[PDB]
Ligand SMILES: [Ca+2]
Ligand SMILES: [Ca+2]
Ligand SMILES: [Ca+2]
């Protein structure tokens with residue numbers, strides 16, 4: 001609480017997020033359950049560059 | 052959104068993306084979008100909802116600041132300066148707040164009381180008839196026909212085809228106010244604001 | 258000139274120029290069909306769901322969906338979409 | 354010269370040299386397609 | 399005579415071809431090196447209390 005008075009800042013670091021994406025079934029029928037984003041986070045971050 | 056007192060409605064209408072050449076969605080204007088969205092029927096091309104007249108003149112349009120910018124810039128290049136002629140675009144927020152009482156002096160009269168001296172049998176007013184007879188026009192509203200602690204607005208259209216003398220409008224609802232309306236030879240609207248109070252107050256006189 | 262690029266049972270030229278549904282079949286729009294009760298429809302001939310809702314252009318125009326959907330959501334350009342909220346009717350405040 | 358090695362509906366030569374989508378079909382890229390609104394795409398074939 | 403020489407989830411062809419998850423290290427493309435994670439826990443601050 002004294003570091004807070006010295007002008008320091010509290011940071012909210014998000015370590016991970018769980019979420020889904022949507023896949024259309026060619027007639028406009030979106031589904032999201034089962035399509036977990038974490039299955040692609042490791043694969044995208046490895047062949048990419050962050051801007 | 053269409054407010055239509057005693058029932059509200061909210062719609063989403065598809066708008067073409069102009070940057071994508073492969074976006075083959077049909078292009079619509081604001082008036083066509085409103086007609087498709089609320090099932091409005093047009094009598095003289097004037098888009099009645101059920102029998103409540105709905106136009107940029109018969110109701111009051113309310114936009115957010117981003118939509119009003121896109122409408123103001125598109126209102127220039129248009130020959131017809133009608134708002135209902137601007138294209139529908141994505142993320143464009145429109146709100147239609149129909150009036151509690153309304154008269155076009157032609158076929159729709161919703162007021163519970165009457166005005167003093169009308170003088171219809173004209174052919175002006177942006178449509179149909181209009182009003183005349185410099186003699187004072189007033190209306191008594193029993194304050195049982197309004198809500199207790201609301202803030203209202205009073206609007207209309209006025210033309211003086213020879214840039215002649217002024218109009219003086221006074222309203223007695225809560226603070227008796229008076230203003231000096233100077234018409235033009237073309238048509239404009241004024242939109243004076245008042246407010247009720249007192250929970251069954253004296254009366255309302257415009 | 259009678260293709261169906263999005264496979265939603267309505268041809269391309271009909272979606273571009275206007276159509277209506279007669280006996281569960283999309284027909285080219287004549288201006289005499291109005292005054293009989295028919296509405297003129299247009300949609301994206303490359304999208305099967307023009308408005309982006311669960312229902313295709315044909316299911317909407319045909320009315321071939323849930324019968325509790327409003328009549329204006331039969332237009333391929335108006336989305337069938339619910340706006341749900343909560344409204345208060347009595348407010349109770351307590352000390353305990 | 355019109356193979357599809359990865360079976361993603363875009364041919365190899367198009368993915369190598371540039372393509373764009375017109376009526377849901379991948380077409381070879383002409384430099385006049387820009388200024389109309391079309392973008393030039395390349396991918397791993 | 400084995401379809402998975404190293405005994406991992408991926409066949410010899412999927413490994414050699416690189417036709418698997420793109421977050422797998424480049425050496426695990428060898429049909430003889432197994433694609434296999436070694437996970438552990440490491441301590442960064444030790445806190446001892448009386449209560
Ligand atoms: Ca009139
Ligand atoms: Ca079609
Ligand atoms: Ca379509």
Ligand SMILES: [Ca+2]
Pocket residue numbers: 357358359360361362363364365368398
């Ligand atoms: Ca390919």
Ligand SMILES: [Ca+2]
Pocket residue numbers: 399400401402403410
């Ligand atoms: Ca083998």
